[PDB]
Paper text:
In contrast to its eukaryotic counterparts, bacterial HSS synthesizes 1 mol HSP from 2 mol PUT. NAD+ serves as a non-covalently bound prosthetic group for BvHSS. The interface area of the dimer was calculated as approximately 1700 Å2 by PDBsum indicating a stable dimer23. The BvHSS subunit consists of two domains as determined by CATH24: one “NAD(P)-binding Rossmann-like” domain (domain 1, residues 3–163 and 394–425) and one “homospermidine-synthase-like domain” (domain 2, residues 164–395 and 426–477) as shown in Fig. 2a and S1. The crystal structures of BvHSS containing NAD+ clearly show that the active site is localized inside each subunit.
The electron density at the active site of subunit B is interpreted as a hydride transfer from PUT carbon C4 to NAD+ carbon C4N representing a “transition-close” state of the oxidation at carbon C4. The electron density at the active site of subunit A is interpreted as representing the hydride transfer from carbon C4N of NADH to the still oxidized carbon C05 of HSP, with a partial double bond between carbon C05 and nitrogen N06 of HSP representing a partial Schiff base (see subsection “Hypothesis of the Reaction Steps of BvHSS Catalysis” for details). The inner most amino group at nitrogen N01 of HSP or nitrogen N1 of PUT is coordinated to residues Glu-210 and Asn-162 (inner amino site), whereas the amino group at nitrogen N11 of HSP is coordinated to Glu-237 and oxygen O2D of NADH (outer amino site). The nitrogen N2 of PUT is coordinated to Asn-162 (center amino site). The polyamine nitrogens (N2 of PUT, N06 of HSP) are bound with a non-optimal off-center geometry relative to the center of the 6-membered (benzene) ring of the respective Trp-229 side chain. Based on calculated interaction energies of benzene with NH4+32, these positions will most likely result in interaction energies significantly contributing to substrate binding and recognition via cation-π interaction. The substrates are further stabilized by hydrophobic interactions with Val-115, Pro-163, Trp-229, His-296, Tyr-323, Tyr-325, and Thr-396. The binding position between the inner amino site and center amino site will be referred to as the inner (binding) site, whereas the binding position between the center amino site and outer amino site will be referred to as the outer (binding) site. In accordance with the observed electron density distribution of substrate bound BvHSS, a hydride transition state with a partially aromatic nicotine amid ring and a positive partial charge at PUT carbon C4 seems probable. Thus, DAP can compete against PUT for both binding sites explaining its reported competitive inhibitory effect. The aforementioned HSS products and the observed diamine binding patterns imply a highly specific PUT binding site at the inner site discriminating, via carbon chain length, at which position the redox reaction solely can take place.
Author numbering:
A (entry chain A), B (entry chain B): 3 to 477
The structure:
């Protein structure tokens, strides 16, 4: 039957029971051993309560707030007998504060985003940099520096951020192998970074194309997506952000750097979900992606940084999201930005509504000798329905990643605060791959300068096709 | 009991039998007296032939080219017994040359676009300026100066260009009534221009929202539209163009003017269908439109120009398209520009495939004492099917405009080369209105500054809400 990877010897506290929580619960029940009364879900939504009740799980209908999270979570996470697991799959809660709470009390932790307490994302009195994922991530890195070691807490371990970090490692190994480069795999951050440098990887797109669609057309004045609408709009309205490669010779006028932190990123003074980049996936071939800020855009570029003895970065790949969401979400963005306000209503397409499609999600490594290499999942809604309940393909890539992170955390429970880039990528993918559908590596000769210049003057660098100058849409 | 307006006692030569030809023929049959054998349809496609044969109409399966159009069309236009009518609804043919040919042979002429011979729109040797609708229109104006008066030829008399010119006049009349401006209704171009100036009309959007959708979702790698795909893509890849108002205080860096001609327009060095503008319609409320070049953008601005004794323009409204096509077309544009090439295939949604929706098409007059006024048609597909065969709502707005133009031409056959702006707008709308569904005027307090600036610094002009600086979306 299904593998049972581990016994959880304590409370399992799932915060949030939206599209991801709903998809993750069945995997937790499937793959871990524990008494049913150990698991409890926390979510303020009536919709969520009704679904939870239907699934026969304990449910606390409460919003976790700055004011109550200590009083609520400390007792639940320390119920016993042994180590509990905080599975944080929420919006509007502080990943940092909850993470630190769990660690203080010896509870394992995992989430899929560095979320802030409600009132951050759309605070007009915060400058764009202060609303950046770069900034949010730095609070986690600072927490790690302040308290090294201790109980394992896994930050940003969903599909992307999360799984894609493992894909990058696998892709690097595949590229090397395809070039006839043999020998031991890297085992340290420094060795991974040097592998990327040595193979001449100039940059990386998180290259995604979601082709899922419903039996009904997009309703007017309704934002439609295959996962969190609130979450997508939140990051969509954050500044465009990207890990910034050492090979880049140009940046936009409204690009800005950071005075502090790991040094791996820049941001643009414009919303990422209204910023387009030229990208590519196997099924989409050439496409527009949206340059939506994402944790991995920074974490991957940071991870793969090579520094000299003075500590100056000598190599680093460009890294960023190039997101083509489902067609109804594309229309939803057009509608939202076109009106200058969020729609009156929203909905997440679920399994019962989606007629066909895949969530093609992978990493596009470019600039090396074989030009460009896409590695990732082509999971279809059809396969999803066969192998996991209560979610679509988008949800399953995420929930299975949380599963992998949980297994890893349980197996490595004294590793301290860790990112997806810190995990054993082979073990994680071993656990996750049964839920990822086709996992393939594809080379292409496409570049951002394909068919260019066109009928109008363009600001392009023909000496280096993958320069951000050629990727960013400026029309 | 449909009205039969006039007898056409000469040959009726329809060039092109696509979506508009198919919608227009039955209106010609319905509203004109003539012997059915004197109608001839010319179109190179097999699809066209089979539709024409099904209607028992004489058909010539030939592409009209610069090499054959004289020897092909002259005998058809002059067949007698009386004055013929060339109804040009084609692509890839020269409106100018065919128009001049008709005029030379005493035949009436009408079309819906200043189309060039095949090889013009995507000619890499042409400068962007030469590819502009401004330039193409100047060839018609030059033809009129060279041969003033004579047989009537109606240039660009579809829905837009065409009908919307009449909408502008009606809107100006309504606005004057609502604003308490007293006087005789204008009866010359000078008086119309003066009225617009006196009412304080800063600019005009051709503000359109097409909500038609089919029983099937958009297919991958197929461009979908509700009218000509070839036609729409052609103008979509022409430079963005607009009639340029005297009130404008700013233009983008890649804006350019013209050294000669009527002087009413500028163009941008970027494709119009990948240029977004902030606009508004009654059903859409605030929306993105695409700044696709259109003849009326220049012709309306030119028509409403006030000049001093020296010949300098002292008033002129901004005028341009703000097009939100059907959702499948929005997706098609995203797909096309995203891949950097036209889709492998295309289809026009017809009356058998469309489930619901309207083509909300009107003119948005702004800058005056009541901020903004939208006047136009909200024709639905349901209403369309009730009153006209073989076309969707988009097609009927066009075909009925051609009908009106044809009635006008027959009633004024010695008026020379004329634009929609030169026609008796009341007579034309009298003929067209039965086919336009609700025709309404709607005020709004919305402006392009509404809700701005947001979370990011924006390059706006807070002093004058309707400045192009605020309307244009700047990637
Ligand atoms: N890294 C990745 O690949 C992905 C990450 N995510 C993230 O995971 C989180 C969940 O995503 P979805 O389940 O799709 O979102 P969703 O919008 O479907 O559900 C979010 C849930 O959080 C609940 N919630 C709101 N305020 C709360 C509070 N104060 N305390 C507890 N719960 C609260 C809501 O009631 C809702 O049920 C989001 O933060 C999202 O950004 C989502 C998908 C992919
Ligand atoms: N002003 C307006 O409101 C308006 C709106 C819609 C379309 N139009 C214009 O009307 C024209 C027709 O639109 P449509 O939707 O019917 O287009 P369509 O693409 O459906 O049909 C065009 C037809 O032209 C024919 N054709 C191609 N080359 C030809 C040639 N050399 N000689 C004769 N025929 C040829 C094709 O076979 C096709 O049947 C286009 O130029 C379009 O831009 C104007
Ligand atoms: N803040 C959440 C962002 C991470 C992406 N989340 C959802 C997955 C959608 C794309 N697979």
């Amino acid at each position: 039957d299904w593998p049972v990877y581990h016994r959880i010897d304590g409370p399992i506290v799932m915060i949030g029971f939206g599209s991801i929580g709903r998809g993750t619960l069945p995997l937790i029940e499937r793959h871990f051993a524990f008494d049913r009364s150990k698991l409890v879900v926390i979510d303020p939504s009536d919709e969520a309560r009704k679904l939870a009740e239907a699934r026969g799980v304990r449910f606390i209908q409460q919003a976790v707030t700055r004011d109550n999270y200590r009083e609520l979570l400390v007792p639940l996470l320390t119920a016993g007998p042994g180590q509990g697991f905080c599975v944080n799959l929420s919006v509007d809660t502080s990943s940092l504060d909850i993470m630190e709470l769990a660690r203080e009390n010896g509870a394992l932790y995992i989430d899929t985003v560095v979320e802030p307490w409600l009132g951050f994302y759309f605070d007009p009195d915060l400058k764009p940099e202060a609303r950046s994922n770069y900034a949010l991530r730095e609070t986690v890195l600072a927490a790690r520096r302040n308290k090294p070691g201790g109980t394992t807490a896994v930050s940003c371990c969903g599909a992307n951020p999360g799984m894609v970090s493992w894909f990058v490692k696998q892709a690097l190994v595949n590229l090397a192998a395809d070039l006839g480069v043999t020998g031991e795999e890297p085992t340290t951050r420094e060795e991974w970074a040097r592998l990327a440098m040595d193979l001449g990887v100039k940059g990386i797109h998180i290259a995604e194309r979601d082709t899922q669609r419903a039996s009904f057309p997009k309703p007017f004045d309704v934002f439609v997506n295959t996962w969190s609408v609130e979450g997508f709009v939140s990051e969509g309205l954050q500044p465009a952000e990207l890990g910034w490669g050492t090979f880049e010779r140009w940046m936009p006028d409204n690009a800005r750097g950071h005075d502090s932190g790991c040094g791996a990123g820049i941001y643009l003074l414009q919303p990422g979900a209204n910023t387009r980049v030229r990208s590519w996936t196997p099924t989409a071939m050439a496409q527009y992606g949206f340059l939506v800020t994402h944790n991995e855009s920074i974490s991957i570029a940071d991870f793969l940084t090579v520094r000299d003895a003075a500590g100056q970065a000598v190599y680093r790949p460009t890294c960023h999201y190039a997101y083509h969401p489902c067609n109804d979400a594309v229309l939803s963005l057009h509608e939202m930005f076109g009106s200058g306000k969020r729609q009156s209503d929203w909905r997440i397409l679920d399994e019962t509504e989606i007629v066909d499609g895949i969530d093609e999600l992978g990493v596009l490594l470019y600039g090396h000798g074989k030009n460009a290499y896409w590695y990732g999942s082509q999971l279809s809604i059809e396969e999803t329905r066969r192998i996991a309940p209560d979610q679509n393909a988008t949800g399953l890539q995420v929930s299975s990643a949380v599963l992998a992170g949980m297994v890893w955390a349980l197996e490595n429970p004294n590793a301290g605060i860790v990112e997806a880039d810190d995990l054993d990528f082979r073990r994680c993918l071993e656990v996750q791959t049964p839920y990822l559908g086709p996992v393939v590596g594809v080379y292409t000769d496409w570049t951002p300068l394909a068919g260019r210049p066109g009928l109008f003057p363009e600001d392009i660098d023909t000496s280096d096709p993958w320069q951000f100058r050629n990727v960013l849409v400026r029309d």
